Amino acid sequence: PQITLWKRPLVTIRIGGQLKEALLDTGADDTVLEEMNLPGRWKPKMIGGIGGFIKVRQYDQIPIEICGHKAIGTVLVGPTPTNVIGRNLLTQIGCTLNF
Amino acid sequence: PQITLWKRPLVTIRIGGQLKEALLDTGADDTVLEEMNLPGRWKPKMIGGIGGFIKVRQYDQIPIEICGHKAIGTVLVGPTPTNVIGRNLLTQIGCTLNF
Numbered sequence: 001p002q003i004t005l006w007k008r009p010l011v012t013i014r015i016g017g018q019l020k021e022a023l024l025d026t027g028a029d030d031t032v033l034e035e036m037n038l039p040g041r042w043k044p045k046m047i048g049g050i051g052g053f054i055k056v057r058q059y060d061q062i063p064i065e066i067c068g069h070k071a072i073g074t075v076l077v078g079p080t081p082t083n084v085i086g087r088n089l090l091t092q093i094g095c096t097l098n099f
Numbered sequence: 100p101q102i103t104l105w106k107r108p109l110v111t112i113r114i115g116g117q118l119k120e121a122l123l124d125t126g127a128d129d130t131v132l133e134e135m136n137l138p139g140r141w142k143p144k145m146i147g148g149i150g151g152f153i154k155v156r157q158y159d160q161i162p163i164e165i166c167g168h169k170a171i172g173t174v175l176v177g178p179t180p181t182n183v184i185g186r187n188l189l190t191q192i193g194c195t196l197n198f
């Protein structure tokens with residue numbers, strides 16, 4: 001579809017069998033989701049945003065559905081105020097920016 | 100133009116008669132640039148994101164050219180890791196997400 005930017009670009013995603021609302025963020029290199037208990041082994045990691053760095057848990061090969069579009073990749077889990085879908089996943093569902 | 104997301108969506112902006120590089124960021128509500136001098140009066144403000152809150156200077160009705168397209172709006176300047184063009188300006192140039 002086509003999403004305008006008058007409002008935050010929120011979409012419904014499905015991960016770990018759960019449905020959530022995430023922001024489509026062309027500015028995020030990675031995907032960061034709110035704290036949740038995903039199964040599997042993970043690696044500790046530090047990611048930086050506008051106000052500094054936060055510690056996150058990196059999970060690989062996680063299937064995720066973004067607004068009815070299948071994708072699979074790395075997802076970082078940490079104390080983030082909102083779920084962020086980054087370029088790593090946006091590229092998979094053929095998402096582009098137009099103007 | 101149509102921009103893919105395999106690489107960071109960077110563009111050249113012109114402001115104050117100066118050239119700079121910035122990121123098209125749909126996850127950012129506002130536009131924030133690295134510290135620099137902008138004519139006019141500014142008011143102290145604070146914005147937050149991943150990592151936390153930072154202190155910025157707010158300049159209103161600043162003219163800025165984004166990859167050839169003109170916009171006039173609020174520009175924030177402060178200790179940002181990178182220049183970010185937020186939704187306030189993306190909407191002015193008719194930017195949308197497509198997939």
Ligand SMILES: CC(C)(C)NC(=O)[C@@H]1CN(Cc2cccnc2)CCN1C[C@@H](O)C[C@@H](Cc1ccccc1)C(=O)N[C@H]1c2ccccc2C[C@H]1O
Pocket residue numbers: 023025027028029030031032047048049050081082084086124125126127128129130131146147148149180181183185
């Ligand atoms: C991988 C990760 C997700 C951690 N990336 C980012 O946060 C990058 C960081 N870089 C920097 C970087 C840092 C370290 C290394 N390389 C690059 C600068 C740009 N952001 C992208 C931002 O789009 C993220 C959003 C997240 C958010 C949305 C709503 C509410 C809270 C948090 C963000 O920071 N948004 C805020 C925002 C941003 C700009 C202007 C105004 C506002 C307000 C607010 O919407």
